[PDB]
Design a binder for these strands. Structure first.
Ligand SMILES: [Mg+2]
Ligand SMILES: [Mg+2]
Ligand SMILES: [Mg+2]
Ligand SMILES: [Mg+2]
Ligand SMILES: [Mg+2]
Ligand SMILES: [Mg+2]
Ligand SMILES: [Mg+2]
Ligand SMILES: [Mg+2]
Ligand SMILES: [Mg+2]
Ligand SMILES: [Mg+2]
Ligand SMILES: [Zn+2]
Lengths: 136, 116, 85, 45, 122, 107, 23, 97, 95
RNA sequence: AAAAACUCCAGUUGACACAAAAUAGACUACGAAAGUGGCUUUAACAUAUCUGAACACACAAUAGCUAAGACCCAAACUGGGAUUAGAUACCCCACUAUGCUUAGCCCUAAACCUCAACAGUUCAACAAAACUGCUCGCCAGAACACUACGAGCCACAGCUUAAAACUCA
């Protein structure tokens, strides 16, 4: 019976969260990379609420691109969102990285409720030429 | 269902250019590739996370760490017993997947031949 | 950019099953062939070597499909030997 | 016989005075081309 | 040959929509086209955001026309609709059914190729 | 250089061109269609001018005139695209075959 | 297969280029 | 005197036709504790697994009716100049006698 | 002599298989049919092994999909949400 | 891993290119080859016996030169930072020539599928089974030699053609 597809502004959406519709719920942004991951919290109407990262948490070069720093930054941003008064959150992820999976669990343990996860990762259709393959 | 390979390779009777150029000659061997390990075991990440948390809060207070450290030891023991379980399971035989040894047995009992 | 957000390549959590949602996300995206594409596009790969790798993948697919076919075809034969002698 | 079709369809072809009627009729009317197909191959709207 | 103009206007009221339509078909007649018929797709919300000559529009009005005209009329109408801002989009295409649909006898079974390698014990 | 208003080939045997509307006549004019209609009309014109037995494509001179009109079409294509070396080679090979068949016809 | 032939030719061509740019 | 061509034209197999989804009665000649092999017709016997339902009524001389797909299981692979076989025939049973 | 075989056609031949759209026509405007054969999540066109139709019709339908995409009748990223409750023909496994 | 570099830095949202065109493509189509796989239009893809110019003509991947321009990205060179005893490189950061559109030039590649075109048939080893009738082209030990000389070319550190002397088994 459960519909895995997300709701649409056109009716009908038979599921609210905290007595709220899907659209107005705040959105969390994760930008994952091999060297570091960056996390942010924003309102449904573009207003940023909280922002953190492994660098802001105080991790060095080798430690920025890890899962533990991701979990700590997630805990931090979730604490910020809860202090602001945000219970639910819509996840958005961008790119691969070590702490990609870790940020969500960090947020959950911090005390946020993830509703949906969207893979808003960039994809070029042969647009630009990346760097050449390095030889090690 | 399989993709056809009429004129993908460089043949005499194939006028157009070839598409495929495999390094080895495509002959179905009577031996199957044995399975492989996936990655290096890792566990207790959330346990050690909550442990470092309560540590930095309580200044290494064991009576307050009790629950974190108990959960960590229990998860470590679970990982160890799960390793032993999956080892005995792989030895006795993977359920749902077909074993390489008996695959080779079947293929040597009914082997294919490229020649006549 | 112009397309609207929260429609494509999404997963709705049910009963707070975040790990299952992420697993289904990986499953669908790997079946559609995106993560491989992006980890390949990370660094630029020349046309000749890309063509070689793609031919290698085609040959591997055909070989493994034939292997699975013969396995499913002859697995029924593997049973208790009725005629010992 | 093929000439028969496009010859009589000249009356259906709009003109200068028929424009301010056909344009209005078309913009008042609605048309949709969408139609799906099931497993066995039957058209469904 | 036949030419189908798929046209997308902005979501606006019937008077100015009819004005744009009558001026477009007047341009057709000036170029020398002969319209077979007009098909209204209707007003619908565009799937992805677009940018007009000076603005953006999320909704639109889909219309369709089919006509007979020479070749230079095609480029003349393309440049006309590019210059015109009331026309969000205008696209000429050939007719699919004008190309005779080749009779289809079904999918033939492909037998597995053999004699790839010579008879060698190896 | 036939006129543009000349109706299609296939619609010449039919006597319905007098009764049919002038708009339909214009539609059936070759200027509405592509250049191949004009090409075949010119082929028929050269046939009626030259050949003793029409609708005989197997004839050497029929092939010659067909390839000649094709060569003029390629010429126009080349003056439209000075860059198209593919069609340049096509024209050169066509005129080579044309000279070959011209000399064998002379023989 | 072995490539000593083209290796010799490569080395000789390299030396020729060097001498050309020198003289 | 009777020609083999006549005996074949009058054979049970030429009137049987394709074995695809055609009921046939057969019996077993060898049976392992878990499976039974029915001798039904033609060259090959068809192997089968005993169903847990009515599993007791499976002994020598049992007349079981069942459908089938082919008389011999074969398949041609890539490097198979001759198609490999199984010396068996696939068949599905839904009743006895 | 009369009982001997004879060269003859194969009446046991099952008729040639035709895809569901082998005989039907497809155009760039049938947004429903053109979004039927495409990923709802990623928006990419499914391969032939997932689709199960002849190559000519596969080429035609993918060309029409790309044409509708570039024209504006259909997007490239996300399938139209209204056409998700349609008959599912392409065989999947993730569910 | 680290160093260096920027903080006019980093993240969301709204607008924007002369840049190249996922998936389909597990498709085998076109073109003589080189190549062509985002969309629409135009013109158009030779010869209904075969072969055939290295005394000709026409193209000829990428790279490069000539004069205008275009600036996301990448990158020779170069500079800097790592590492090394040393590193004129492999690791990292910045950028130019250049990759692109015009009017030309240069005319070379593992230009290989190293398997010539046409019409056909059923064993040295390896590779992609053995072959038949005719035709053009190519080859006669290695290296000297994609060299010297000569001849031609809008080429001037070049390209095409191509030896000789001496040494060896
Ligand atoms: Mg090899
Ligand atoms: Mg592809
Ligand atoms: Mg030559
Ligand atoms: Mg250049
Ligand atoms: Mg530059
Ligand atoms: Mg090549
Ligand atoms: Mg060669
Ligand atoms: Mg030749
Ligand atoms: Mg060279
Ligand atoms: Mg020389
Ligand atoms: Zn079909």
């Amino acid at each position: 019976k459960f519909s895995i597809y997300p709701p649409i502004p056109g009716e009908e959406s038979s599921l609210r969260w905290a007595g709220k519709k899907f659209e107005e719920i705040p959105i969390a942004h994760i930008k994952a990379s091999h060297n570091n991951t960056q996390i942010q919290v924003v309102s449904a109407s573009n207003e940023p609420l909280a922002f953190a990262s492994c660098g802001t948490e105080g991790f060095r070069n080798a430690k920025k691109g890890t899962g533990i720093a991701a979990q700590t930054a997630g805990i931090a941003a979730a604490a910020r969102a809860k202090q602001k008064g945000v219970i639910h959150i819509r996840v958005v992820v961008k790119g691969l990285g070590p702490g990609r999976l870790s940020a969500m669990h960090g947020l959950i343990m911090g005390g946020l409720e993830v509703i949906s996860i969207t893979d808003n990762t960039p994809i070029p259709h042969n647009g630009c030429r990346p760097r050449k393959a390095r030889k090690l | 269902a399989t993709p056809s390979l009429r004129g993908r390779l460089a043949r005499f009777g194939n006028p157009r250019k070839p598409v495929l150029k495999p390094n080895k000659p495509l002959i179905l061997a009577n031996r199957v590739g044995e399975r492989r390990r996936e990655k290096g075991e890792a566990t207790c990440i959330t346990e050690m996370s909550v442990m470092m948390a309560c540590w930095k809060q309580n200044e290494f207070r064991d009576d307050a760490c009790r629950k974190e450290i108990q959960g960590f030891l229990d998860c470590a023991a679970r990982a160890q017993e799960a390793r032993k379980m999956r080892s005995i399971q792989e030895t006795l035989g993977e359920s749902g997947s077909l074993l390489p040894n008996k695959l080779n047995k079947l293929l040597q009992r009914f082997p294919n031949k490229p020649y006549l | 950019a112009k397309h609207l957000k929260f429609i494509a390549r999404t997963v709705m959590v049910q009963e707070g099953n975040v790990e299952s949602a992420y697993r289904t996300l990986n499953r669908i995206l790997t079946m559609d062939g995106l993560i491989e594409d992006i980890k390949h596009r990370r660094y630029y790969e020349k046309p000749c070597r890309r063509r070689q790798r793609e031919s290698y993948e085609r040959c591997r697919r055909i070989y493994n499909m034939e292997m699975a076919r013969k396995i499913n075809f002859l697995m029924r034969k593997n049973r208790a030997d009725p005629w010992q002698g | 016989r093929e000439v028969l079709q496009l010859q009589e369809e000249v009356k259906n072809f709009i003109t200068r005075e028929n424009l301010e009627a056909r344009v209005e009729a078309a913009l008042d009317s609605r048309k949709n081309y969408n139609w799906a197909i099931t497993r066995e191959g039957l058209v469904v709207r | 040959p036949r030419y189908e103009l798929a046209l997308i206007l902005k979501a606006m009221q019937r008077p100015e929509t009819a004005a744009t339509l009558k001026r477009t078909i007047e341009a057709l007649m000036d170029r020398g086209a002969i319209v077979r018929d007009l098909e209204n797709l209707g007003e619908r919300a565009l799937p992805y955001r677009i940018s007009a000559h000076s603005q953006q529009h999320n909704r639109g009005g889909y219309f369709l026309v089919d006509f007979y005209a020479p070749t230079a009329a095609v480029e003349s109408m393309v440049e006309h609709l590019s210059r015109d801002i009331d026309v969000i989009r205008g696209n000429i295409v050939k007719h699919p059914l004008t190309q005779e649909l080749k009779e289809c006898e079904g999918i033939v079974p492909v037998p597995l190729a053999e004699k790839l390698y010579s008879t060698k014990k190896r | 250089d036939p006129p543009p208003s000349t109706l299609l080939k296939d619609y010449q045997n039919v006597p319905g061109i007098e009764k049919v509307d002038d708009v339909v006549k214009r539609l059936l004019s070759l200027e509405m269609a592509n250049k191949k209609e004009m090409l075949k009309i010119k082929q028929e014109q050269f046939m009626k001018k030259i050949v003793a037995n029409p609708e005989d494509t197997r004839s050497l001179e029929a092939r010659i005139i067909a390839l000649s009109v094709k060569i003029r079409s390629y010429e126009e294509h080349l003056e439209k695209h000075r860059k198209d070396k593919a069609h340049k080679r096509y024209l050169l090979m066509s005129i080579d075959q044309r000279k070959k068949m011209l000399k064998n016809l002379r023989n | 297969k072995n490539v000593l032939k083209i290796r010799r030719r490569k080395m000789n061509h390299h030396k020729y280029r060097k001498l050309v740019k020198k003289t | 005197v009777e020609s083999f061509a006549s005996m074949l034209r009058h054979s049970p197999l030429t009137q049987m036709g394709p074995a695809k989804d055609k009921l046939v009665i057969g019996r077993i000649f060898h049976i392992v504790e878990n499976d039974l092999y029915i001798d039904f017709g033609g060259k090959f016997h068809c192997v089968c697994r005993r169903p847990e339902v009515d599993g007791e009524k499976y002994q020598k001389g049992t007349r079981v009716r069942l459908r089938l797909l082919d008389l011999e299981l074969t398949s041609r692979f890539l490097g198979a100049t001759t198609d490999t076989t199984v010396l068996e025939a696939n068949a599905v049973l839904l009743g006895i006698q | 002599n009369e009982d001997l075989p004879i060269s003859m056609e194969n009446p046991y031949k099952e008729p040639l298989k035709k895809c569901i759209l082998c005989g039907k026509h497809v155009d760039y405007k049938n947004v429903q049919l053109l979004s039927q054969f495409v990923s709802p999540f990623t928006g990419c066109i499914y391969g032939r092994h997932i689709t199960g139709l002849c190559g000519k019709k596969q080429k035609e339908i993918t060309k029409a999909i790309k044409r509708a995409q570039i024209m504006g009748f259909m997007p490239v990223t996300y399938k139209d949400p209204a056409y998700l409750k349609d008959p599912k023909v392409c065989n999947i496994r993730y569910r």
